Amino acid sequence: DTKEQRILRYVQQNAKPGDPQSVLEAIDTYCTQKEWAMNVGDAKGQIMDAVIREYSPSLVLELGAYCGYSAVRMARLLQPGARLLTMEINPDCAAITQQMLNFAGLQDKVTILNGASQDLIPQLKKKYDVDTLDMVFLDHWKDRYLPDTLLLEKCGLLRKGTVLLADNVIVPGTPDFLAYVRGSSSFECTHYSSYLEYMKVVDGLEKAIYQGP
Numbered sequence: 001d002t003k004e005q006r007i008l009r010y011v012q013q014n015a016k017p018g019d020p021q022s023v024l025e026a027i028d029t030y031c032t033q034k035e036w037a038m039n040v041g042d043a044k045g046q047i048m049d050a051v052i053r054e055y056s057p058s059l060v061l062e063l064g065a066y067c068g069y070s071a072v073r074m075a076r077l078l079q080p081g082a083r084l085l086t087m088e089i090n091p092d093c094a095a096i097t098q099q100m101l102n103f104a105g106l107q108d109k110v111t112i113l114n115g116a117s118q119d120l121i122p123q124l125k126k127k128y129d130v131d132t133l134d135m136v137f138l139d140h141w142k143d144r145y146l147p148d149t150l151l152l153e154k155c156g157l158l159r160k161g162t163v164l165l166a167d168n169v170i171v172p173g174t175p176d177f178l179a180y181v182r183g184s185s186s187f188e189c190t191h192y193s194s195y196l197e198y199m200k201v202v203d204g205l206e207k208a209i210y211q212g213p
């Protein structure tokens with residue numbers, strides 16, 4: 001099996017069905033004790049939690065699902081009726097994420113789409129009946145953060161106040177995105193220093209709030 005399948009099995013055997021916090025704790029334990037994996041993790045996850053609670057977003061888009069850790073993390077804090085859409089290019093991972101969400105009992109709040117963000121984003125309004133997004137979590141390949149941000153604006157998916165929250169702005173880093181949002185009068189940016197998941201390595205999240213017209 002793969003590491004991702006091992007993580008899912010560990011959750012199924014070490015967490016409580018329908019209990020998202022137990023799911024997160026199981027993944028974090030596995031990744032600290034058994035095998036590292038690129039989940040956003042608990043340190044950065046606590047910052048994410050605080051941001052989600054501040055904005056209470058009704059519609060969140062996540063780019064990059066992997067095994068579903070961050071989707072579980074965000075969806076467990078959404079208000080009744082609020083929704084998360086997550087995009088995942090790797091079909092094996094999309095299938096694991098669906099199973100992870102099912103186990104957590106969050107399947108009614110989350111829609112996991114198997115495809116590339118750059119292909120799915122232009123379909124959100126017409127196919128998925130999206131108007132604008134309240135929050136976007138960027139956590140896919142780091143060279144897509146900037147192009148997908150520009151694409152989201154082109155497609156009319158950002159509004160005044162839309163919150164972009166970007167993982168890994170230090171490690172691996174996303175230099176073009178970071179320079180762009182920090183230099184743009186159309187974003188108000190804040191940096192949240194933290195640590196790479198499961199490791200004693202500095203990382204951080206960037207929050208970039210869209211201001212533009």
Ligand SMILES: Nc1ncnc2c1ncn2[C@@H]1O[C@H](CSCC[C@H](N)C(=O)O)[C@@H](O)[C@H]1O
Pocket residue numbers: 038039040041063064065066067068069070071087088089090093115116117118139140141144
């Ligand atoms: N263009 C793209 N569109 C959708 N998914 C992408 C993508 N490029 C990479 N990915 C996916 O982005 C993921 C990065 S890891 C995501 C970790 C997850 N957010 C968590 O914290 O739990 C990988 O699973 C990868 O397959």
Ligand SMILES: Cn1cc(-c2ccccc2)cc(O)c1=O
Pocket residue numbers: 038039040139140141142167168171172197
């Ligand atoms: C995509 N991705 C990759 C890493 C990573 C991979 C290899 C060494 C260090 C970091 C961490 C992430 O949070 C992430 O989203």
Ligand SMILES: [Cl-]
Pocket residue numbers: 040041042043044196197198199
């Ligand atoms: Cl952590």
Ligand SMILES: [Mg+2]
Pocket residue numbers: 038039040139167168
């Ligand atoms: Mg990440």
